[model samples]
Target: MYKLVSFRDSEIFGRVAEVEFSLIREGSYAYLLGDFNAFNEGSFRMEQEGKNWKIKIALPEGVWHYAFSIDGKFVLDPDNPERRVYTRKGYKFHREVNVARIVKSDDLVFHTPSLLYLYEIFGRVHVLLRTQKGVIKGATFLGEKHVPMRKKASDELFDYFEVIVEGGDKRLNYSFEVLTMEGAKFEYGQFKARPFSIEFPTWVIDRVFYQIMPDKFARSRKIQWGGDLIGIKEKIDHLVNLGINAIYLTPIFSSLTYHGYDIVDYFHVARRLGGDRAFVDLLSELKRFDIKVILDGVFHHTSFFHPYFQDVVRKGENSSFKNFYRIIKFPVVSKEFLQILHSKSSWEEKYKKIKSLGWNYESFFSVWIMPRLNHDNPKVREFIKNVILFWTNKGVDGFRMDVAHGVPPEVWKEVREALPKEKYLIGEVMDDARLWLFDKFHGVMNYRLYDAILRFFGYEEITAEEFLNELELLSSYYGPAEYLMYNFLDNHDVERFLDIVGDKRKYVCALVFLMTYKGIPSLFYGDEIGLRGINLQGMESSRAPMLWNEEEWDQRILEITKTLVKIRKNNKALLFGNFVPVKFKRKFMVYKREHMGERTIVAINYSNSRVKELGITIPEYSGVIINEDKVKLIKY
Candidate 1:
């Protein structure tokens, strides 16, 4: 069996393509077979050893067709982007596909940029370097060459280089070598590799986002929680001072839990969290601050204890709401299922009950806690659609869906089509943003990276070098335009990044790096305070109210973030700009941000003792605004 991994961002950022296949017969090695001739004519081999295959291929800024040839036989690798955006090198009227709508990508500003990608293959690597989205082809390989980063000469710090063999039918064979250079000097072997590509946006638009937990953000009524619309209005100055353009909040509708995930009412706000009146007031306040709010839409399943769930259970199979869900087959059950079914009842029993009118999850005599919503129900989906339309029209700048992977792709498509384009969406797919784009979800939460970062901290699996490489390579999904990743060192669900890093300085340094790096950065409320909790058991206490006054403890984090945001304001290069990785080493990594002239270089010293040096040539020009002078200057 051969594995076809997209290796980088599949169709969007923070995701990749993967085709898990196995050999049909016994074989010594494997190779990828694909039409390298469509975008650019070329034949290459993949790096394979035993059953392990490490394939990496870069494609032009368009879509093409190809298959993999294991050993000598040909077959299609199942992991291709559901859709790809294609075009010629020069600006032309090329076509882009969404399976249904033919998009004229030229009208959109997403494009390819000069990038140098280093792809690792089972201890070996292959280099793909380009300056533009022009056609690429191999010049034919002679011998394998190893390129190593010359510390004293070139500024590149590599994990060594590798030898690659280009073979027939785009067979890419690769192996490892250590040195600083490129060219054929030797050959290890040959195999097939998967071609990884990206789709990028063109314009340099800025994003100023706001992340809010609906329950804690503000409660419109006097009987509601601690915060309210008046409270938000009072904080407008603070937001403007922070320099954020968008606000993202958690689910706020009527729910059984304080977090509001167990929604009882979809259209109306949680009276405890706040009602529609409060939302309107919050919007009014935000508008005055010139900021956009991204709300959390909990669409997967409603509160287990919601009225609909209760009604269906009580009414049994003959309930009028029977068609609203994929019910269980027992006494009464909801039928909608992609993840876990609502109940364990047999299908026939559940179906019969629904026909009689039972359309909700089956209720057990022992437990009456929460009821599950059936995703497979057409009527259920229709109701959800109405809810989405209602909230969007009510003035939600964007949506961040909760528990995204469990939901069906078709439902996402319906919601996306019915909604406006400018509405930004980042689904909580955890590790599968690649699959969600097929359904039109813009991006996904960077759960993999977050988990990886934690692993590095715990010393369980990753090293500092590995951490930096993972972050740098996350951009490989596409050019910056297709980038929809949300960069945050910590979020509400996990132990704060500050606590995880264990040091104020180191945490602040990494935070600075993230704020200036590519993609939108998310800031969980109270994370600015360096809050702590022993385990994930009682996160709410740690996720408690945000301290507004200076009298409260941990004011420095808020100060630091505010400072970082202010610095990013004058430095537009940090926003919607190209990500330039300057210094990468085991000790430290520094990157520069330059957009329309304003420049910001972030130097982060990950090591505890070593003094990291950094440099990048900036030709002498008048009117250069340098924000801060930390260490020194190489040349002026």
Candidate 2:
């Protein structure tokens, strides 16, 4: 027996109908071939779940002819009543193929209270209403005024209607009126607002962040130049001069390693990086400069030496905190595991040996030293929540959650509910995080954009048009959360941008884009000084000591970076404006950032040769234009 289903919905591929083909059989391989791709063989492989083999694909509206290839034989869908006669040139006779019809669902309207659906920009509250394409006309009634919503964007399945209303009192009581193309009219009762009030951390919009590893940034009154809390405090003047308004410090909790990720004590600051008092002093100093601080939250795991984990090791299942971790069996650490840890074997060999030992407890990335916490446990949840609140009370403005994707979204939602709404919570997601940002997190590390930037500028593997397409896809995916994305060129875990490109010209071109793009641009320490390092040797290679001596600095790079920072700080268009692609070629690109009549045009030429004709002219230049390797910024 086989079952076929088709429905329309919005997914990563845009608004499209999804057709699910399922076949019930035992010990049989199934594949789908259809008119979708000229019935290409071995294209759609189905996976087995119990006795059913299933596969799904997104299709546009219309009837599709498809069939199942079960165990090297063609079979029509048994459940679908519709059939179409189809024949191939190589076939001896015509055959009837299964027919599936896809249609738009009636319930294609969607609206939520989150930032993606509703937000405020430049004193105007923007509302976005979504519905099936060309199916309905939408309008919003705010108080006594009626405003028509225009179709601003559309994917294959849905059209996005947008309207901006003047936020006179910061409160809204509204209702949506929808008129179907077929002449039916109704009110979307689900979205009937009742004195709705929305509030979010608007300060994150214009912030320019500088990421620092305390031990590598600077040292304060030390023998050598090892960094510490006071060392970061001593560099406040430099940060201010560079136009940095926020700083994100990696884990500062008590740990044995220099990276400070494997936290042993969540309540205490690392002694080597100066104690709790030093951290307090550093906070006070940064507050004087009006610079915000974001601390790293490593709630997914803790060091083996942590008090709860240590107690578990000592008392086994009898420990009060035994449920804190996922323990498969008693005696968390075995003798064989100890022997493997003590041996001088290569990490690969040690990993194999540990796997053979059948470890009893769950660890982070399979490393025994860092045990993964059971977030489902109430005690563990409360403990993590307290850790967050304690630091929130310590004057930190935000937290960047490490391995945030691993933690349950429910836990983060609970945490977000308990914490102050003004504080920012950004997750460390290395891929598309559109679903993660709404309600659970304010933003995420924009690694997808970083990869696109690297491919376009550093590797030259993708064309300017491809890069622009990626940018557009991200804009649609992230929606309003794009402004809060933590955009960066390099971080402690990866090779520096300079090291990858090895050309100051290309690096500066990418830097210009990063600063002007729609996101919160973050700079790694020493990035402005043209510091180059790779992570091939170790992650520490990328975490090299900062260059303090003026003579050793790349003066040209530093000056350009400083100028870019100033431009970003001064231009509201660059901060919260909409990104619109103007012109693009193989080695050249042009884009416009516009906000409330303020416009800034950014043009870049990646090739070494001069571009004689840009196809556009700057009537009056109001911004800087650098022609060293060619990056031009014009504000008019």
Candidate 3:
């Protein structure tokens, strides 16, 4: 069976058409090959869903040849009656292949009332249109004038067209006109222009971020060793001196554990961190320095001790809050099971013992302490929506959703629509986040880029060319939303980047790239001074206390970090520019950034000794060169 799936603005970016192919045959393995991929040169492997083997791939507008390969045998699509003979020059010259035709029309053209399709840059409002690649020319008719749209970007199957309008009234109506490659002109439907508003937080675009675990940052006089909100307020000058304008603190809500991922209360600050009064003071202090605050929102799950979960545990299936959680069994937690779950054994042991007793509840990674919420229920969604508004009302700039991929799309849609447009919401997805970028959330914690950076710079397991390819792929996936991605080398959950690389030279090179690259550069607390830690069994080593003593600081690393931050803030090209990869080798890489004609070239030499074959002259290498063996920066 074959079906055409049109793209949705919330689910896909830029691609217009997707074809789902299915075969009802019994085979150990199935593969789909078509002219879209040169028929077996880059064949797509089909997955077995139920009784049918299926695969969906995006294809351009054209008549194409396709076939299915089952267990090393070529077979035509049995559902499609159309067939054609394909001829080649050499041996095995004649083959019968199934034919499928994709007819192009104005329906393939898509535009939405969103920031992705319409956003204001500087004083001009830019509009975007998506159509099948190389098939049409597009223009926008605004008010009385018709302005041609230029091709801005393209992927495998679609092209994005953009037109910028200047000096227009705040309220305007527009329509699109499409000219097919065959010289057929079609006028599309009309749409009222949305009111001019910056959906994304403008302050987050150009600011450098520092992520802190409140318990690990600074200690208060009242507490023995753990940090508090008052302590963070006291160290406000330290953040100001480091030039970071945004701070992302891990869960500060009331929780049972020190790590705080399993939240118990959504409305109140943790008493361990000095409660609501200290939180208010901290927000006030950060605002005085123009520093933005991003709180961690753990909406996917709640602590087992949370009131709703406790109610279910006590009352079982008859509880009013039974619908709040996913309970597959009646006795949610038995007396023996509860004892074993909270015992002094290791996590693996505790999980194994509970599973042996038939643990029957959905949770975050099956840890019985945190139960996953049933977002399908209206009450759960309403509770989460109110939680978002409560903190956003508390004067926080944004929220970084924990385990965002685990939450349902409808939950995000409802929460996003309820919150104000300017309040930023970023996800904690560690993979390709294109589906969550434009409409669902503003951006994501960019761990895919983190993995590429680690492989190339830390482990040397990938070539410089492979690193550039990964960077390009990420750029294509994010498009205009690339600027909002949260870029980081290491965080509280992983081994520190410095400890992984071990060499100060390599670390500095990666640091230079982070500050200059697109997205918001986020520095984990204590990384700037070369604090070393590894991922142990509990991740406590990586979440070690911040180094406050000046004598223990790595002066060289700190100075380089400060210099990179200064350069990033002073240059607009580095902050908001189009990225262009220039050259790469095993030991070096070069790239360019340009914004409104301002250009900056960044070159990194990952080797200990320079080969001098790079032919670029080094003139007065004081301000331009960061380190003789590490990096070079040029501006024109």
Candidate 4:
């Protein structure tokens, strides 16, 4: 037999008194035995009840971790869903409970785990209590006595209790306790998580970013703009007019191809595009416009022409740099040698030669020219770190690590420690970033958000429900980190977002969402001016040279981008506010963003037809903040 005398009322205790714990057993007699009783002196014997056994034990207010034992055999509460087994001394399983100051059985009475790092290290914790006069206290689990907590917020059933500590390290194992108005003492955190980690960088919320492919962004009259560092200076006016505060540029080291991924030399600047002096000049010039820069760090591989690989090819097994790369044989056979043998039977002859020689080697897909570096060698990791330090020392603000998921966590930690804490370290993560984002990298490419937007507005394959759920999965873990993860519609590697959704209204709505959403907005070069790529190899097509002609530019698209950028820059709430999904429908969606008690509502009409209100009350709208194209925002 079993019975529950809930928090609502008890024969011996009320809402303000000690909690009553009850238990039932099938035998002729039963006792309440656990850590609180030591199975003897503190134990209570149950009295007879119809068809069952029952006993009630009084407990002071607070959360407790315990289990039940019937006639000296340990057991778990079959009725309780909450239980944990920890390895402190030995594996011990226990059920959790809360007693004092709780009116309902399910009262988890706590706000979020607060972790403010900048001005203070004190964590603000909360518990629900309704007493106008009471005391709450906390302390390190095994250390000094507890301190009183200050009351912060109050609702009808509960008042929020708060306390702040001062420090940033993860060294304390702490817990909470409370003294109610009726003198009942409650303790918390007997079996709960300790202090949380410090918050992420808050400055990123104020940034606006622009992503550029150096080769395609601009070309100068005096030099090869496609591969030169100085060429970017010619397009400064374009970015400033677009309200871009930061620029993310692809690799610019000396290389054999226009897309400079194959680095022949890491330390030397490309003279074909005006040399190292020109690169310095460009950085100095960008500083004049107050624009920060992020360099693309491609440490995963190097060009076939690198000196280390060249020496390995010449000396065979004798080369000291043999460990630098992964090779199938002591000597390497050139791909060009096979190509020149037979022009008539190219495929057959090439296959025969490669098969006859067993010429298999690890590479980036079929691009043998770019050999993957063997990170197993520490020298290779040291070399990559040197490259990162070299650029950051030259005034580069941050880095966008290419293929970051492919790199090891140890390498990323080394980079983070090397870079200044203020500089951003973003990555090219295309999928879920939780495993990659904790304390290592600051953010990612946010391609997940891109796919969600495209599915809803471009393909029309997913309903608003599916789209919001995708975002919620992302938002659940990212939190403030999402504010700077480089949300975008398209980039150099994919087809343009505008081209995918030919409708001008839908395209503009996407831009508005990108700006208002909780993430830094990154505009691919030429996107604001409405550039389109219609080729099958979309990468090459999207990376076409900038269209500078005034007659060819999409004036309307450019204006829309400018307007959205302006709104983002002026509104602090949109930059770092808490994102709340308000409503979702097949043709429309409504959501709220709030910061410091200020609320802003964003509504999207996915369809072309006119629509009425969101089927909910919209407070003082502050007279229409933005109503353009297909999206609208209201301030309350």
Per-prediction tally of clashes: 74, 1, 0, 3
- Model 1 residue 240 distance off true place after TM-score fit, in angstroms: 2.6
The reply for model 1, stretches above 4 Å from the true place, is: 1-205, 214-230, 333-372, 456-461, 478-482, 533-541, 596-599, 610-612, 615-636
Candidate 3 Cα RMSD (Å): 10.0
- Preferred candidate (lDDT higher): 1 or 3: 3
Candidate 4 has what TM-score? 0.66
For candidate 2, report its TM-score.
Answer: 0.73
lDDT, candidate 4, 1-636, per-residue tens? 122354333211113223343444554334443333222211244455665445554442333344554433455555556565421110012234322232445554332233211112113221222233223332212213355554533333444444334333344445556555546666554422344433445556667888888766666767333535566787788888989888888887888776778889888666666678888888998999888888888876788778988787667678888888767455465555633543446755454654454333344435666666766578887888898888888988888987665555457767777677667888876555543454667888886687778778778877877787677645533443555688888887777777878866677777767878888888888888888774545443677677788799988788778877887877756765666667677856777776655566787766656566655433321112332233444321
Every candidate's lDDT: 0.49, 0.73, 0.73, 0.60
Sliding window of 10 residues with minimal summed lDDT for model 2: 619-628
Q: Give the Cα error of residue 5 in candidate 2, in Å.
A: 11
**Higher-ranked by TM-score: 2 or 4:** 2
Considering TM-score, which of the candidate structures 3 and 4 is the better prediction for this target? 3
Which residue pairs collide, candidate 2? 15-157
Residue-level lDDT tens digits of model 1 in 69-181:
44444444443344444332111213442211212233211211122133321122333332112111122222243343211110111121112222222334333222113
True-vs-predicted CA distance for residue 32, candidate 4, Å: 51
lDDT of candidate 3 over 298-325, digit per residue (tens): 9889998899898998888789999998
